[PDB]
């Protein structure tokens, strides 16, 4: 599955601008961005709802696509087992009892599998919708906010179950969910979307994690410390709004504190910690609004 030179526009307004994308040796990829930047447009392009996108999409006809979009789609009047039966027959090659039973047992909807969907709640409907997505037997399964109105325990359990499904079936996953701290638990690579193009592509495989040191101080002092650290060491990232300065992992604090003491200016908060996706997200996208 490859994308080449996609540029989608709505009249004078431009929504997607010359992106490239490829699943390179990775199983779980996260897509992160704001609201109305073209996250749903990109997802609709990926799923197949838009044909007049003016580019080239490399997909195979023998390969099926199972998807989850903005809201669960179900027959509200009828029952859940009817929904599973209908989408397994209509979309898959047929109905497999053992396969569907295994999916039902792992996700846990059996106590409430025989009651009508209109009597369900939001988390139950979302889990059932995820089951509808796996009903297709996909090679690529893409989910748009699978954990919207569900509690932390439920979300951790659901993502772990999805991870356990990734080895019995040959799966490549794209998740465009918010709440990035649940994403760092299960993700192999993250992509950040700003102004349509894919600006940065962070890939994480092993736990080296590129340890860093965080120094926090107010803006009127942040300029001078920034000058000192650019004149002395080599810097990876800076955050102006929070006064967050993110240098690499430093073992000895002696030379920084003696120099800042002889400088008479002082920092508010200092630590060394494992990196996450939150620093990168704020660094890329706090720039358009604040």
């Amino acid at each position: 599955m490859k994308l080449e030179h996609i540029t989608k526009k709505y009249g004078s307004n431009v929504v997607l601008n010359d992106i490239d994308f490829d699943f390179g040796d990775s199983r779980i990829v996260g897509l992160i961005g704001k609201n109305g930047v073209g996250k749903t447009t990109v997802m609709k392009v990926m799923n197949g709802n838009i044909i007049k996108f003016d580019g080239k999409v490399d997909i195979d006809n023998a390969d099926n696509i199972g998807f989850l979009i903005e809201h669960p789609k179900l027959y509200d009047n009828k029952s859940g087992l009817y929904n599973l039966k209908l989408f397994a027959q209509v979309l898959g090659k047929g109905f497999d009892k053992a396969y569907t039973d295994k999916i039902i047992d792992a996700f846990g909807m059996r106590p409430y599998i025989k009651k009508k969907v209109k009597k369900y709640s939001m988390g139950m409907k979302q889990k059932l919708a995820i089951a509808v997505s796996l009903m297709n037997k996909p090679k690529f399964l893409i989910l748009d906010e699978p954990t919207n109105g569900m509690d932390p325990d439920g979300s951790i359990d659901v993502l772990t179950t999805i991870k356990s499904l990734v080895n019995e079936l040959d799966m490549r996953i794209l998740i465009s969910s918010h709440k990035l701290e649940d994403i760092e638990l299960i993700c192999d690579r993250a992509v950040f979307l700003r102004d349509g193009h894919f600006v940065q592509d962070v890939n994480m495989e092993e736990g080296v994690a590129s340890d860093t040191t965080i120094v926090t101080v107010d803006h009127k002092d942040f300029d001078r410390t920034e000058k000192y650290l650019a004149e002395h060491f080599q810097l990876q990232n800076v955050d102006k709004a929070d006064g967050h300065l993110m240098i690499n992992a430093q073992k000895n604090y002696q030379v920084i504190l003696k120099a800042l003491s002889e400088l008479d200016i002082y920092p508010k908060y200092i630590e060394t910690r494992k990196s996450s996706l939150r620093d990168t997200y704020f660094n890329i996208n706090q720039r358009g609004d604040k």
Binding site: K44, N47, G48, N49, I50, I51, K52, N61, I65, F67, I69, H71, K73, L74, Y75, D76, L86, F87, Q89, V90, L91, K93, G94, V132
Partner: protein, 247 residues
């Protein structure tokens, strides 16, 4: 070829499970029985003779209006519930979707025609008189097929363009019931009444609705060609728009 048979199969099951279908059959049977009883208990005939044109026309109109509501409901179900985006993945799916929906429309039409045939048989069996001919029931089935196919394709096109439902129901009711109401006052239009009356024999809406009341399906050659051409043009346009429209 699994998607085409599965879509038609599930609409029939949805029809056979709902109680409104058997409520419509009871209502229709009650109205025909009341009309038959009124005609049989009249004081002019001591022999209980019944003519079958009135029952034919009345049962045809009621059953037609029920079948029309059933086809529009089946057509707009997915658009009402928003599940349509699962059916809009590939191109082969968009075409199998339209073909299967048309096939479902055909199945609904044949079933409703069969029900009308059976119901008329039991009314004729109950009463006494002169039985009809097989060509009449067959030609009634063809008229049912043509009417339902034309209107189903038109409403399918409107629901593709608008993706809503209250307008579709109101629009279907508007085309069926406004024209018989509107036709008498057309003559009162200054110097264009004759022109509109002659031109109404070529407008598909006008003569299909006029011929809805009629007990015979006599068609001219021009009428047959234009109706078939309209069906083919609507099908081709629907296929093209479903394969070129972006949601």
């Amino acid at each position: 070829s699994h998607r085409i048979l599965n879509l038609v199969k599930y609409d029939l099951y949805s029809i056979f499970k709902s109680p409104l279908t058997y409520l419509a059959i009871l209502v229709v049977s009650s109205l025909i029985a009341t009309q038959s009883i009124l005609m049989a208990n009249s004081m002019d005939n001591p022999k209980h003779i019944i003519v079958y044109g009135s029952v034919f026309a009345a049962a045809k109109w009621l059953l037609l209006i029920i079948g029309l509501m059933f086809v529009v409901k089946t057509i707009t179900r997915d658009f009402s519930q928003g599940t349509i985006q699962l059916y809009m993945s590939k191109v082969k799916t968009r075409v199998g979707y339209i073909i299967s929906k048309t096939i479902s429309i055909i199945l609904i039409s044949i079933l409703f025609a069969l029900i009308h045939y059976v119901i008329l048989i039991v009314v004729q069996a109950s009463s006494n008189g002169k039985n009809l001919a097989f060509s009449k029931y067959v030609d009634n089935l063809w008229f049912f097929l043509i009417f339902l196919l034309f209107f189903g394709l038109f409403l399918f096109l409107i629901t593709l363009a608008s993706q809503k439902t209250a307008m579709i129901f109101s629009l279907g009711v508007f085309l069926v019931l406004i024209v018989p109401f509107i036709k008498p006052f057309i003559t009162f239009i200054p110097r264009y009444g004759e022109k509109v009356l002659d031109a109404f024999d070529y407008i598909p809406f006008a003569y299909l609705t006029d011929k809805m009341i009629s007990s015979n399906f006599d068609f001219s050659n021009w009428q047959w060609v234009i109706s078939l051409g309209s069906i083919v043009i609507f099908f081709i346009l629907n296929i093209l728009y479903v394969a070129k429209k972006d949601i």
